[PDB]
Amino acid sequence: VKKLINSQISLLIGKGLHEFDSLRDPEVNDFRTKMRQFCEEAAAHRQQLGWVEWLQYSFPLQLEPNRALLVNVKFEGSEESFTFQVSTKDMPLALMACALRKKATVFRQQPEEYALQVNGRHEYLYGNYPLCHFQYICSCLHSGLTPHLTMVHSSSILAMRDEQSNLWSLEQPFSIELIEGRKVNAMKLVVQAGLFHGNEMLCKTVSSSEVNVCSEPVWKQRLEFDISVCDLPRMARLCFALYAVVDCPIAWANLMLFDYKDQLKTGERCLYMWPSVLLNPAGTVRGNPNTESAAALVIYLPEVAPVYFPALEKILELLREILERELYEHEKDLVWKMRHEVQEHFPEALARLLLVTKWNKHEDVAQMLYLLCSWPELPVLSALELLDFSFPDCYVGSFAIKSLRKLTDDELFQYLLQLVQVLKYESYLDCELTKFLLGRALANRKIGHFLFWHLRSEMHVPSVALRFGLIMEAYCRGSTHHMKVLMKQGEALSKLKALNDFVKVSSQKTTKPQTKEMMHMCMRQETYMEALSHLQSPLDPSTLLEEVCVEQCTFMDSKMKPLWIMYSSEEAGSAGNVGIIFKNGDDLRQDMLTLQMIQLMDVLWKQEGLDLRMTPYGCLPTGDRTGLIEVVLHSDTIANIQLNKSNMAATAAFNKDALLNWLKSKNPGEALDRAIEEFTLSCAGYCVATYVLGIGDRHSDNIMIRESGQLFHIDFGHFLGNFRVPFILTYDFVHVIQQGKTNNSEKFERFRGYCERAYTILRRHGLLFLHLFALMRAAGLPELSCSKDIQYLKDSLALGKTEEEALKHFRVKFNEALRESW
Numbered sequence: 001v002k003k004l005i006n007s008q009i010s011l012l013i014g015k016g017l018h019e020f021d022s023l024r025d026p027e028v029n030d031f032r033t034k035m036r037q038f039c040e041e042a043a044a045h046r047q048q049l050g051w052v053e054w055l056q057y058s059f060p061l062q063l064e065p066n067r068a069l070l071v072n073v074k075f076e077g078s079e080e081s082f083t084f085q086v087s088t089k090d091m092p093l094a095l096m097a098c099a100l101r102k103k104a105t106v107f108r109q110q111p112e113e114y115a116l117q118v119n120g121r122h123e124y125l126y127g128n129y130p131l132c133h134f135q136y137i138c139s140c141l142h143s144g145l146t147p148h149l150t151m152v153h154s155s156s157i158l159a160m161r162d163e164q165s166n167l168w169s170l171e172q173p174f175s176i177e178l179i180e181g182r183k184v185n186a187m188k189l190v191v192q193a194g195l196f197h198g199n200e201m202l203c204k205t206v207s208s209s210e211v212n213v214c215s216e217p218v219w220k221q222r223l224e225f226d227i228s229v230c231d232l233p234r235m236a237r238l239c240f241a242l243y244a245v246v247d248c249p250i251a252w253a254n255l256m257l258f259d260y261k262d263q264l265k266t267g268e269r270c271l272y273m274w275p276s277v278l279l280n281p282a283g284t285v286r287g288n289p290n291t292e293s294a295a296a297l298v299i300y301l302p303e304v305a306p307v308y309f310p311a312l313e314k315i316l317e318l319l320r321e322i323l324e325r326e327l328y329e330h331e332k333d334l335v336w337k338m339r340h341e342v343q344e345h346f347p348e349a350l351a352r353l354l355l356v357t358k359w360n361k362h363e364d365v366a367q368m369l370y371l372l373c374s375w376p377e378l379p380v381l382s383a384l385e386l387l388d389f390s391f392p393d394c395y396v397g398s399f400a401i402k403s404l405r406k407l408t409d410d411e412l413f414q415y416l417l418q419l420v421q422v423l424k425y426e427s428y429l430d431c432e433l434t435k436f437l438l439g440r441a442l443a444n445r446k447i448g449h450f451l452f453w454h455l456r457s458e459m460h461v462p463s464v465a466l467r468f469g470l471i472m473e474a475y476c477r478g479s480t481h482h483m484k485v486l487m488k489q490g491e492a493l494s495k496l497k498a499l500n501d502f503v504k505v506s507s508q509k510t511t512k513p514q515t516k517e518m519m520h521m522c523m524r525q526e527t528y529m530e531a532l533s534h535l536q537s538p539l540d541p542s543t544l545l546e547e548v549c550v551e552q553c554t555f556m557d558s559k560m561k562p563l564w565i566m567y568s569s570e571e572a573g574s575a576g577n578v579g580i581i582f583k584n585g586d587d588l589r590q591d592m593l594t595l596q597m598i599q600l601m602d603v604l605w606k607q608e609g610l611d612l613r614m615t616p617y618g619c620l621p622t623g624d625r626t627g628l629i630e631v632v633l634h635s636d637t638i639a640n641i642q643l644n645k646s647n648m649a650a651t652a653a654f655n656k657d658a659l660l661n662w663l664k665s666k667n668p669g670e671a672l673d674r675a676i677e678e679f680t681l682s683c684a685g686y687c688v689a690t691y692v693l694g695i696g697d698r699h700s701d702n703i704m705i706r707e708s709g710q711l712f713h714i715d716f717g718h719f720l721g722n723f724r725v726p727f728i729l730t731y732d733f734v735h736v737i738q739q740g741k742t743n744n745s746e747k748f749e750r751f752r753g754y755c756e757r758a759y760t761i762l763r764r765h766g767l768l769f770l771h772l773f774a775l776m777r778a779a780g781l782p783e784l785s786c787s788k789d790i791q792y793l794k795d796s797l798a799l800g801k802t803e804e805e806a807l808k809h810f811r812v813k814f815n816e817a818l819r820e821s822w
């Protein structure tokens, strides 16, 4: 019945749906019901899409940001296949017609009714794009393999779609009654509070009277705040901090002064507080659900009788350029004076205007919101700024989502990590961002995939557990089939957790080979073989993890014993030979963010025609200190290469030549030049990427080389110079760039040219990183917690410099890095 979906969702999110009901909360109850009906509307629209439109849902195109190639094509009900000489500039339609003419001769007797599936994968090639503009063809051309595609008819694609179906009057000062506590401490107890509107204060922070660590301490004091009640903004947020004194932080707690129906909150409130590292504005406005052992304040918010926030209709009724590109009071007031001409001539400066409006005075808010509701939509870049906690107001928030609707699915994917973390800054469950992310997730299954996992990865955190569970529950109402697909993934990871816990215990007692043999026995059980096999990869749902290749599975010797899990496929061939690494015990978010930013750098470089040959490999947290990492096969560490062990192809007279002999052995004869280029390009990319991102602790063990020449980085424990990390040039890579010559300035200075181009391209999108890192502060990443972390980026890119000045400064750091190389 309905009941089976509920128990499946419950298992899928790690939080039973009985628990949502047991709160008796009207906001939860109205989120669930209102978002259920919204996601079910999507699910209906989804099942009546056309077959091409369904491919757009299920397998959205992997596109890149003349010349010949072999393509091998087959038809779905056949092993008999054909090979074709085609051009890289031809459409899929041209190729599909080629296939049908070779079939109509072999079988002796329309291209529009087909889609090319990438063999043994959930990737499809269709639409009016040249072959080399598809990521599969482009990947294939660099790596050198023949494409393997399959003609899938529309009736068979529709068969897939089928089987997935489901007010101003009050001028008194705002005040409270601080009643009492119920907590523990080692002195006297002070309760400082404050009215914040985002980061900014609506008035100074009024303390409570000092009182002894008496219980369960009692106060029964008025606190009177320096602000009229009519001047409270819609997102007025009252923020407490309980600490002790003769500073000693103990707890904190926030709540919105207006409830989710716009009503002002009266009367009594028990705030269940959270422990501390004093006053914490951006902290969540929901209480600690650990009600048993939580320090709890009770307070009263005076009755003033039922007063709702004014409806929008009521609100709407009620030297200049030189600065506009931190400002002084007169400059702020000149920016406010000319607010109408900001709307008319400089609409991209909305943010700076929003940071000069007095949010603690209500006429100014209406005068602002009046400008805001006719304000033209801004570019995607500008809207990512307005999502930050710096702009808490709902109309500004709702305006931002309105300017972000024109995000492409690829862009939305690009920023999905950051957008999810902004859900933590949200004050209420039902919000324009949630609905936006949910509606786009339900319109694109890849977006839907990754939204699920970004949320599912944080259910171990009580502050977001309720929000995230509910969103996940809503998504599942709107995609029964993808729920089941994801359960299969989660069942795989449950088994990997249990197999990894075995491997840890075992490794501490017996030898490496005997633990590996005993891992393989455990995997060869029905329950494991079934669970570990025949799923989609959480790292990339278009990757199919088919036959778990137990022989080649192992574990790595590092402290947490990450498992090495290899998968094969009959239908896919070499594309089906894929590896994943399950790591349990480490917080992979730090890594994931670092790889996504390098991926973005790659995207931004390719958009200016620069292909530095990066390796943007999957990294995805899936659970508490648990996640997956995509295996880049056919690669080894600089450490393992430079070991220089004998009876190998890299038998080297000098350790400087170990890499170059290694590259030689893997790329013999004419192909050595192609790999040194791959190496050089990739070396330059990661050199810049590490310098901008401030990635420290780089040694041979955590730098890998692919057998193509491509270099890339692993293990991102520290970033943004969290030990001012300088540019890193390594002699043995310099040796490879220079083709093993001691003096080869032409090949070396090309590499400086690549590094400089790469560095100047990121400086132009400096604001994109600044905005995206600003939104990431929401995550509570230990090394992304303050302004000096964001200042690192500003200084690494040199964002307040002229392009000429910054390039001069970059070349100092580069020449310094060159000197350091021996």
Ligand SMILES: CC(=O)Nc1nc(C)c(-c2cc3c(c(S(N)(=O)=O)c2)C(=O)N=C3)s1
Pocket: 556, 558, 562, 581, 583, 591, 617, 629, 630, 631, 632, 633, 634, 635, 636, 704, 714, 715, 716
């Ligand atoms: C042939 C081979 O081995 N290729 C590899 N490709 C990748 C992507 C590896 C990797 C990446 C990362 C991490 C690890 S690991 N083993 O340290 O967990 C391993 C980690 O922790 N963060 C990122 S290894």
